[PDB]
Amino acid sequence: SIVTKSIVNADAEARYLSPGELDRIKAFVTGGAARLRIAETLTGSRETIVKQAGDRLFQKRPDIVSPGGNAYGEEMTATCLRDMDYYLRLVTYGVVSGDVTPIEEIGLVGVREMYRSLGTPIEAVAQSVREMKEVASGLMSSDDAAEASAYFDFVIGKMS
Amino acid sequence: SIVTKSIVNADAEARYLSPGELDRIKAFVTGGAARLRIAETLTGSRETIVKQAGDRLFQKRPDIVSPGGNAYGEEMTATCLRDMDYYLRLVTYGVVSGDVTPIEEIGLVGVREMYRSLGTPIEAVAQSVREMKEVASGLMSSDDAAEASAYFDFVIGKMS
Amino acid sequence: SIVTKSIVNADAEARYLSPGELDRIKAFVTGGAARLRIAETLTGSRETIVKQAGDRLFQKRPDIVSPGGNAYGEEMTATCLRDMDYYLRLVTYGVVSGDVTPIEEIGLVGVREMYRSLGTPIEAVAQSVREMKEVASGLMSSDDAAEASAYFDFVIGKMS
Amino acid sequence: SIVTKSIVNADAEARYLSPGELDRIKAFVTGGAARLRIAETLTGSRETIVKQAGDRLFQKRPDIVSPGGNAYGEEMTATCLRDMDYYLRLVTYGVVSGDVTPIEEIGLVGVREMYRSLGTPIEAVAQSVREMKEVASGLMSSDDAAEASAYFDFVIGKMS
Amino acid sequence: SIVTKSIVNADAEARYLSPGELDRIKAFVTGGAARLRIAETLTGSRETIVKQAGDRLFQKRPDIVSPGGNAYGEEMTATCLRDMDYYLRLVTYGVVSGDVTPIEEIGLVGVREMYRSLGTPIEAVAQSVREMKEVASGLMSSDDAAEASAYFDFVIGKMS
Amino acid sequence: MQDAITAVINSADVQGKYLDGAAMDKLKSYFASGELRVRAASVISANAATIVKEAVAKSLLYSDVTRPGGNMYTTRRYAACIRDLDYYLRYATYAMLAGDASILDERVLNGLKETYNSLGVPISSTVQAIQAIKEVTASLVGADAGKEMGVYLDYICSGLS
Amino acid sequence: MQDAITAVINSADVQGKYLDGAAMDKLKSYFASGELRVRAASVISANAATIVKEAVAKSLLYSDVTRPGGNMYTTRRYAACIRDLDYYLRYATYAMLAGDASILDERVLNGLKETYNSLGVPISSTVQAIQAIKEVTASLVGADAGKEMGVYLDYICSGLS
Amino acid sequence: MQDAITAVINSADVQGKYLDGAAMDKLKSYFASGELRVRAASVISANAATIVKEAVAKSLLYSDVTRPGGNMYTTRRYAACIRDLDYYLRYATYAMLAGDASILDERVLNGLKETYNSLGVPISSTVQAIQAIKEVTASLVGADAGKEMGVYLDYICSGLS
Amino acid sequence: MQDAITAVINSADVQGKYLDGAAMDKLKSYFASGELRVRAASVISANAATIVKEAVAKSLLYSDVTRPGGNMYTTRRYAACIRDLDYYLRYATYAMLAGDASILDERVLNGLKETYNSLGVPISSTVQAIQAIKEVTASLVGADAGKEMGVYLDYICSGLS
Amino acid sequence: SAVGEFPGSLGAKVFRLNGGLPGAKVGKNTGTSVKFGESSTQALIRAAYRQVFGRDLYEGQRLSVAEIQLENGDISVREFIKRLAKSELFLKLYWAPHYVCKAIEYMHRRLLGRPTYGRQEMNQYFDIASKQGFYAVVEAMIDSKEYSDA
Amino acid sequence: MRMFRITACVPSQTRIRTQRELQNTYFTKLVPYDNWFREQQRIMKMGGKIVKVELATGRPGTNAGLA
Numbered sequence A, B, C, D, E: 001s002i003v004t005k006s007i008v009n010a011d012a013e014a015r016y017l018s019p020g021e022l023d024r025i026k027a028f029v030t031g032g033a034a035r036l037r038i039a040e041t042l043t044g045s046r047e048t049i050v051k052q053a054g055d056r057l058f059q060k061r062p063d064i065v066s067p068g069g070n071a072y073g074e075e076m077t078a079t080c081l082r083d084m085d086y087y088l089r090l091v092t093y094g095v096v097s098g099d100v101t102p103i104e105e106i107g108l109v110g111v112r113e114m115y116r117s118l119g120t121p122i123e124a125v126a127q128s129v130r131e132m133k134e135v136a137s138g139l140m141s142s143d144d145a146a147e148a149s150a151y152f153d154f155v156i157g158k159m160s
Numbered sequence F, G, H, I: 001m002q003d004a005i006t007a008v009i010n011s012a013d014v015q016g017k018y019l020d021g022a023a024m025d026k027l028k029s030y031f032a033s034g035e036l037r038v039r040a041a042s043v044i045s046a047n048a049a050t051i052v053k054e055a056v057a058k059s060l061l062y063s064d065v066t067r068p069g070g071n072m073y074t075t076r077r078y079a080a081c082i083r084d085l086d087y088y089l090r091y092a093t094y095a096m097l098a099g100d101a102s103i104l105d106e107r108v109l110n111g112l113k114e115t116y117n118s119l120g121v122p123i124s125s126t127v128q129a130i131q132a133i134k135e136v137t138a139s140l141v142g143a144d145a146g147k148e149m150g151v152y153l154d155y156i157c158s159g160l161s
Numbered sequence J: 001s002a003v004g005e006f007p008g009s010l011g012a013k014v015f016r017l018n019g020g021l022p023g024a025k026v027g028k029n030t031g032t033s034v035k036f037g038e039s040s041t042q043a044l045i046r047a048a049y050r051q052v053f054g055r056d057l058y059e060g061q062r063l064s065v066a067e068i069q070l071e072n073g074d075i076s077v078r079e080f081i082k083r084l085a086k087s088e089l090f091l092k093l094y095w096a097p098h099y100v101c102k103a104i105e106y107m108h109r110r111l112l113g114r115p116t117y118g119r120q121e122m123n124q125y126f127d128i129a130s131k132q133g134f135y136a137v138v139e140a141m142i143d144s145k146e147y148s149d150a
Numbered sequence K: 001m002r003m004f005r006i007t008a009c010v011p012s013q014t015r016i017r018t019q020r021e022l023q024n025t026y027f028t029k030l031v032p033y034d035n036w037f038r039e040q041q042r043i044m045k046m047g048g049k050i051v052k053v054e055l056a057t058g059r060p061g062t063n064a065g066l067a
């Protein structure tokens, strides 16, 4: 989280937290209510975001569900949706924490290696993440979804 | 400034600014009005604040103005007040920038060597900065008092 | 170049060419006629081998040519086969030189980054090169096919 | 001691003691009587040397005993003279051993960081060391005054 | 030079010379007169020492001056005597400096390679140096001969 | 590196005075533009890879530059060109955020013209590639934010030129 | 390490579950207590050296530790003791800000007892020093922030013991 | 560094064409010369030190440079001179085996002139020594290989001068 | 570096001659001056910080060099300046002990002129500060040793000028 | 005096920039796609990665700017190792999660191939860590004369 | 941050190396400002000659923003 990241940087420099870091922590603490609202909406509608994002992704990149594609078959499609659900949950964790350290640790470091081993298109995964972001932004208010989409954008950029 | 620190961190990681850093920059640019108001207040009322802080510092440690001290006589006392005014200017720079980078660049790096050279007690300097912070807090608004006291305390810690 | 690799290793150890390395260079230069015959055959038969390998690759991985894929479309298929021809020419370069270094230099270093930027499936590219190797083995003698199989398998492994 | 210094240098160079080092140890073991005489004179003038040097330091720098000074109060003055006694004993050990190492390890390495916590003026303590040096030179014969003054000035330079 | 070594160590540790190092410097300067006397004796007896040691070495290893040998012929004998003179001068430099640093720098680094290039036996060179040492010790007082024996043995050991 | 705030503070400190109205107004302007700067930077970070990919598609791909005999022919050189374009975009974003090209001068325009000349990189070709990137970014972010980013993009392009 | 937010996130992740109501409640509690922690951290960072000074003065000055023959006799040993105290203050402040004690185990407590046992360092004396540090920090930081700081300092003391 | 084969491949790749008849013939020519090149390399490897020995004897010894006040006077400097001539011989052998001077350009002459100018090494004398290396190697290996060996050595001399 | 002994040894080695009368008398003179050199070096080391501390005041303190806008206003720049002054003083001490300016030419003058020029430091002001250090060096040391130290410091001034 | 010796066949393999970096000179006047020495420098960079971080890194983890600067010759292998050690990836993996002395000990073993002789080295790097930080500890270990000699 | 581009020639003094040493014999590197002093000290102690030094990054006399 932001607390851990600031602590790590401060200890790497061998110093207490600077006024900038402390002000960032206090601002995050003050704004945590909106973050919890975002997490509540995402968790409550998570089946809806996953369903609609999977539909849009399959429509936009049908070769994924075509024969020879990675997501071919009912089981492969289910695993596709499962990975989408993991990424939505990680997005929620990052939104709550105010920093994308948990997302990076859980589902971004080595993701290239894992998906290369599994035979999955990382760009297709990023497209799925983008679809989830669009659905969630439609589900939330303008500014709220506006600053919720930052973590979706981080995941998309890190995967693609 | 804070934006400069975020840029250098992002460059070190070879990545774009994190969403948290972007939010921090946004909040800082929004609060630039209040920070600029605090800077205007301190710039307008620096002389009274510096004089009051110097008088309190001297009455607490009259050894410096006392014979044999580092700042003996009217000329040396004027130099002492000049130093305190310099550091008040540095604190205004820090509050307007939102970050301690200008403070470190101008008057904290090598300052221990420089005051060892001059013989001045750096702990006395820190106490003087404490008195300046208290006088400023009394002079200006309470809400902006915390923001000013953040950089005042940073100066205290670095000086000590 | 086998001679260039031997020179590089000898310079790295700061020594003259070993008797064994000189013997290997001698044997390679003696067999250069047979080695270059394979390159002549590949250059002559480039078109049929490339086209047949592309058709077999599309049979094995129809998703890439399907809509939404990298190779979908006449122009995309044309450029995919163009890259096929590039890799065949690089394999001919490698078989001529006796070393995989020209292959790794022109068409192998940074290939991951290039195809990630283009969206191309590196796995599909490796499968296509495998099909090219099989076709070349069919069109050549068992010994010559085995000899070229070293370069083809090197390209395959570096692809994936 | 001189023996330990020579042995450490020889060990670091991975060699036996030099003929010059052996001759230095020979001269030291011959002059051990004179150095013991010097140390005994210092130990005799212990309670007088420190007292006089402290008196001269107080008359040179009234701020130390003035209000706001580091050593304000009889307890602080007594502890200052205790540090005086400690440095005199260190100088005794150093002149006896023919090496500054017993002085430095007990009371020189990190002395600035040890006395920064206490807020005592480092240059003030160096001035006190100087004054003890003149008192010892006055109460000491000519040549051995120079012999002890070498070590006293070494301590003065390293601490000041 | 002990002065050179002490200054190099002082620079490397980034501080002024220790009192023990200064003591070593002054003792070396004191012994410089005896060192200069030894060097003067050696430079006065250079001709006789060179001739006698060369004749003894020729008798010990007449093959070196025998036909087909490196030293055979008037020119080769003259160059062999020139090398003897060079090494005696280097020994004089060492005795003056109090250290084998000038000898090592001038004529004792890469000597094995240089004599392998010229075909000269390093065994013969070492034996010649030993003969020069014996002649010089016979021509010089035992204590001074013992002092010069350090440089002579250092040269001999580095030869072998 | 100097941003707007650091530049203002340095200008004040070199003369040695406090903050006056002259730097007061420019600090006001920077605080006004900060919202647009942050939004444009967010958009750029979101679509960084797509921007460079489509700029390469519409500016260099299927041309002599990527053709055999062109500087962008080999796979290694193609990857290096893509990496350079990504660096240009990222440092342009940093300059847009900071309101200054001093960062571009300090971390981009140092040993770049000479390096490209020594390596034979087509300066003009890089120029049109950067112009295509600027056009794509402006279309993606907006007219005012796009123009502000394109100012630093043009500055870096000219400095390399 | 891990803060309270990191702990909640890790528990939810290891169970493979989204943030439920209880996790939201704990996050709300941490957010409620966050301003307090920031204030305490700012105070201690401002007064880092002083608190160490009075901790030593109330605990270790003019005692057998500082006498000749103690572990804190020599100037170098006093510097080492001061460095230990500054580590403990810094990491207790870090734990206070993070709301978690994982950092102390990760950095300090993971080998510190074996370190002092190899060194000969008096753990009873260091426990007394940190216990005095408790009240010295509490005086400047308040009552409830003082309670939190005392919690982390008791953590350090128990790890030492 | 590019040998003859690498030069042919690079020439083909610049136009992006398969190996034409001209490249075929050049590769065959290099294969024909390969036996002579390998024999010369083996002989020079066997007699590397000796060749340097007669070269230094013929060129440098009993000169002002070898006498005191010359650059080659010190034992260390003489060893350095021998090592430099060994480098020249070995890298000329490398150039002979590769059929190209690319290795000599990239490694031997990258900063040789600058370092000689800095260290005060006599360029004229070192050129003369390399020339003497050329005659001795030509004598040892015969005129046929000696011609190309001298070609490479003269390339080194021209680059150094 | 080079001491007096090493300097005379190298000068004799240049011609290849033995230690003649001039070499012997120079060595004897250095041996005679050795004790004075040692005492002066010890005196300098005893209070070397004091020399620079007072010299900056005598030359540069309360001047346009330390004034805001000058190249010494910041604490960083002033600490760098005093670092240079202290290193120059200790190097002059080392040169006085060695009896030769070769250590000066090898450990300070190599590059400082262009370093200071690139950094914008004023050569006039730095030389003035060195001179001011020199007078108090002479006052604290004596007459002969002070003269020698002034000779070395003036060599440093010439190198920086 | 044998610190610079290399362990031929008895110790681990040693990697050096013995060969000229590609593009170091303008002798290769553009083109030259088969400029042979670049796999050597790529192997050197990957071996420095394997040294500082005992394993290979993942795709997003490599320091592209430092890699390209080292390849171009702007910085030496020492500065490349310095930047890899000061990289926040090393901070997160090997510095932060560990007891401070354990971290410094592993860092010393990693950046000099040598366990610390003992408390003198440990005290030096420990004071460095307490005073300045991770960056200065890495800087001190990189700039120690033993590192320069080895 | 401020960077120094330095070209220097450092010779070997103790051993006759038989591996290619020109690259570290004569070279130019980009050393940081905060490391320039110690790098210069190392080169001088090793005995090298500082052929050239330039401030590749930044500008002289930067009171703030030198990062």
Ligand SMILES: *[C@H](C)[C@H]1/C(=C/c2[nH]c(/C=C3N=C(/C=C4\NC(=O)C(CC)=C4C)C(C)=C\3CCC(=O)O)c(CCC(=O)O)c2C)NC(=O)[C@@H]1C
Pocket: C064, C069, C070, C071, C076, C077, C079, C080, C081, C083, C084, C086, C106, C107, C114, C118, C120, C121, C122, C124, C125, C128, F061, F062, F063, F066, F067, F068, F073, F074, F075, F078
């Ligand atoms: C076919 C097996 C796969 C495939 C091909 C594909 N490639 C491109 C575009 C390019 N391919 C290259 C590659 C190279 N250029 C070289 O010089 C070499 C080394 C000698 C290689 C390997 C390049 C540079 C391009 C850029 C365009 C250009 O050629 O100028 C495309 C176009 C994709 C698009 O959308 O534009 C395609 C489709 N695609 C697959 O799915 C196969 C696995």
Ligand SMILES: *[C@H](C)[C@H]1/C(=C/c2[nH]c(/C=C3N=C(/C=C4\NC(=O)C(CC)=C4C)C(C)=C\3CCC(=O)O)c(CCC(=O)O)c2C)NC(=O)[C@@H]1C
Pocket: E064, E070, E071, E072, E076, E077, E079, E080, E081, E083, E084, E086, E087, E106, E107, E108, E118, E119, E120, E121, E123, E124, E125, E126, E128, H061, H062, H063, H066, H067, H068, H072, H073, H074, H075, H078
């Ligand atoms: C005599 C005891 C031994 C011997 C001598 C010998 N030397 C040479 C030739 C050379 N010797 C040197 C050595 C040095 N030159 C220097 O300046 C110094 C630095 C201190 C040294 C040690 C050199 C450089 C040469 C080359 C010629 C020249 O001096 O310019 C020879 C002749 C070899 C030949 O074949 O020409 C001989 C015979 N030989 C022995 O066997 C004795 C052990």
Ligand SMILES: *[C@H](C)[C@H]1/C(=C/c2[nH]c(/C=C3N=C(/C=C4\NC(=O)C(CC)=C4C)C(C)=C\3CCC(=O)O)c(CCC(=O)O)c2C)NC(=O)[C@@H]1C
Pocket: F065, F070, F071, F072, F076, F077, F078, F080, F081, F082, F084, F085, F087, F107, F108, F112, F115, F119, F121, F122, F125, F126, F129, J023, J065, J068, J069, J071, J072
């Ligand atoms: C792409 C738009 C054009 C192009 C690029 C190209 N660049 C290189 C190699 C390098 N480019 C740089 C540049 C930078 N490094 C940095 O750190 C920065 C930002 C801070 C920049 C701008 C460097 C240093 C190199 C390294 C040299 C190397 O090649 O290793 C290449 C590769 C050239 C080669 O032969 O390897 C290429 C191809 N090429 C084009 O055709 C485009 C117009």
Ligand SMILES: *[C@H](C)[C@H]1/C(=C/c2[nH]c(/C=C3N=C(/C=C4\NC(=O)C(CC)=C4C)C(C)=C\3CCC(=O)O)c(CCC(=O)O)c2C)NC(=O)[C@@H]1C
Pocket: D064, D070, D071, D072, D076, D077, D079, D080, D081, D083, D084, D086, D087, D106, D107, D118, D120, D121, D124, D125, D128, G060, G061, G062, G063, G066, G067, G068, G073, G074, G075, G078
């Ligand atoms: C006197 C010249 C200066 C001075 C002295 C002063 N010192 C203290 C307190 C302490 N001094 C020491 C120092 C040492 N203890 C050792 O064992 C060694 C080596 C043998 C040294 C150098 C210590 C450890 C203390 C702490 C108290 C204790 O040891 O029990 C004080 C009082 C500080 C306070 O606030 O208690 C004073 C006044 N004061 C001056 O002004 C002189 C320059």
Ligand SMILES: *[C@H](C)[C@H]1/C(=C/c2[nH]c(/C=C3N=C(/C=C4\NC(=O)C(CC)=C4C)C(C)=C\3CCC(=O)O)c(CCC(=O)O)c2C)NC(=O)[C@@H]1C
Pocket: G065, G071, G072, G076, G077, G078, G080, G081, G082, G084, G085, G087, G107, G108, G112, G115, G119, G121, G122, G124, G125, G126, G127, G129, J099, J100, J101, J102, J119, J120, J122, J123, J126
């Ligand atoms: C002071 C409050 C008490 C005290 C402490 C003391 N410690 C040492 C020496 C060391 N302490 C440490 C500490 C740590 N190592 C770690 O890894 C961590 C953080 C993760 C810590 C806190 C270490 C490493 C040392 C050794 C230092 C060295 O090797 O020089 C000393 C001095 C020991 C000595 O002989 O110098 C002291 C005095 N001792 C007391 O009595 C106080 C109660």
Ligand SMILES: *[C@H](C)[C@H]1/C(=C/c2[nH]c(/C=C3N=C(/C=C4\NC(=O)C(CC)=C4C)C(C)=C\3CCC(=O)O)c(CCC(=O)O)c2C)NC(=O)[C@@H]1C
Pocket: H065, H071, H072, H076, H077, H078, H080, H081, H082, H084, H085, H087, H107, H108, H112, H115, H119, H121, H122, H123, H125, H126, H127, H129, K011, K012, K013, K017, K019, K020, K021, K022, K023, K025
């Ligand atoms: C001998 C023919 C001439 C001569 C030699 C000489 N050389 C040096 C010093 C160096 N020589 C080199 C050259 C190279 N190093 C390499 O790695 C390569 C490329 C593969 C070459 C060509 C270098 C770099 C040096 C610097 C020192 C070092 O070797 O590390 C010296 C002086 C050595 C010293 O330290 O003083 C000498 C004497 N001198 C002559 O007069 C001949 C003409």
Ligand SMILES: *[C@H](C)[C@H]1/C(=C/c2[nH]c(/C=C3N=C(/C=C4\NC(=O)C(CC)=C4C)C(C)=C\3CCC(=O)O)c(CCC(=O)O)c2C)NC(=O)[C@@H]1C
Pocket: B064, B070, B071, B072, B076, B079, B080, B081, B082, B083, B084, B086, B087, B106, B107, B114, B118, B119, B120, B121, B124, B125, B128, I060, I061, I062, I063, I066, I072, I073, I074, I075, I076, I078
């Ligand atoms: C007063 C609160 C304390 C005090 C002050 C004091 N200072 C000096 C001398 C100097 N102070 C400075 C100031 C700065 N240098 C910097 O780099 C910065 C920021 C850029 C600042 C603020 C400088 C440059 C000097 C040098 C002298 C000069 O200004 O010309 C003295 C003079 C001491 C003497 O003359 O010997 C004094 C007295 N002294 C105290 O005791 C107070 C605690």
Ligand SMILES: *[C@H](C)[C@H]1/C(=C/c2[nH]c(/C=C3N=C(/C=C4\NC(=O)C(CC)=C4C)C(C)=C\3CCC(=O)O)c(CCC(=O)O)c2C)NC(=O)[C@@H]1C
Pocket: I065, I071, I072, I077, I078, I080, I081, I082, I083, I084, I085, I087, I088, I107, I108, I112, I115, I119, I121, I122, I125, I126, I129, K033, K036, K037, K038, K040, K041, K060, K061, K062
């Ligand atoms: C002080 C007397 C004057 C002055 C100095 C000044 N110097 C710098 C920066 C550097 N100075 C050095 C010095 C040395 N390098 C060496 O090798 C030696 C001998 C050991 C010396 C003395 C170096 C290396 C630097 C570079 C930076 C660093 O810290 O190493 C500055 C900094 C300027 C800036 O803006 O950064 C200054 C100010 N300036 C004056 O006005 C005085 C007259």
Ligand SMILES: CC1=C(/C=C/C(C)=C/C=C/C(C)=C/C=C/C=C(C)/C=C/C=C(C)/C=C/C2=C(C)C(=O)CCC2(C)C)C(C)(C)CCC1=O
Pocket: A066, A067, A068, A069, A072
């Ligand atoms: C698309 C796609 C794929 C899927 C590919 C698919 C769907 C592959 C499936 C291919 C299928 C359906 C293969 C079935 C072959 C049946 C055989 C050989 C039986 C022969 C019977 C015999 C010899 C018996 C004869 C007989 C004899 C002799 C008797 O004695 C008695 C009678 C009897 C008749 C029994 C992949 C999985 C490759 C990848 C993913 C992906 O997307």
